[PDB]
Paper text:
Full-length MLL5 is a 205 kDa protein (1858 residues), although a smaller isoform (around 75 kDa) including a single Plant HomeoDomain (PHD) and a Su(var)3-9, Enhancer of zeste, Trithorax (SET) domain has been described. Even if a hallmark of SET domain-containing proteins is the histone methyltransferase (HMT) activity, it remains controversial whether the human and mouse MLL5 SET domains possess a catalytic HMT activity. To better understand the molecular mechanism of human MLL5 function, we solved the crystal structure of its SET domain at 2.1 Å resolution. Accordingly, biochemical and biophysical experiments showed that the SET domain of MLL5 is devoid of any binding activity towards histone peptides or the cofactor S-Adenosyl Methionine (SAM) in vitro and does not exhibit HMT activity on full-length histones.
The SET domain alone (residues 323 to 458) crystallized in the space group P3121, and diffracted up to 2.1 Å resolution. To allow crystallization, we mutated an exposed and non-conserved cysteine (Cys 453) into alanine since this residue caused heterogeneity of the protein due to dimerization by formation of an intermolecular disulfide bridge. The final crystal structure of the SET domain of MLL5 in its free form was refined at 2.1 Å resolution with an R-factor equal to 20.9% and R-free equal to 24.2% with good stereochemistry. The asymmetric unit contained two unliganded MLL5 molecules which superposed with a root mean square deviation (RMSD) of 0.64 Å (110 Cα atoms). Accordingly, the shortening of this helix results in the formation of a long loop (from Gly 372 to Phe 381) that is very uncommon in SET domains. This large loop between α1 and β5 occupies a groove which, in other SET domains, serves as a substrate docking site. However, contrary to MLL5, the elongated loops of these methyltransferases sit outside of the domain. It is noteworthy that this MLL5-specific loop conformation is observed in both molecules of the asymmetric unit and does not rely on crystallographic constraints.
Numbering used by the authors: 24 to 28, 37 to 154
The structure:
Amino acid sequence: LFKPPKKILKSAKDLPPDALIIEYRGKFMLREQFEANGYFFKRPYPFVLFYSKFHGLEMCVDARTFGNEARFIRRSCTPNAEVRHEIQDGTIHLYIYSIHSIPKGTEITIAFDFDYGNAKYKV
């Protein structure tokens, strides 16, 4: 369970590891759609989540449109949560899960999803 007091998403309760926290809702686009709409893929637009872990198929969720409190989640190199996917009725949904236990009143963060650090390589 979560809570947002910019606004910051925070654990409402001492969550256990691997706990479903919140769905990242918004408009789903493949990379090509995002680029056709005029935006650059994996550059840090506010309220946009980039996700590449569904079998290498690059997509994003634009939460300027009917998003929820999940759009407020900040990125961190030391995150306590992660984006996971599931298929429901042939539609992909993205959810934020805890990576380990999260004390109540701790900010919920996920790993950087956009091109940060200006690196030559990545792991």
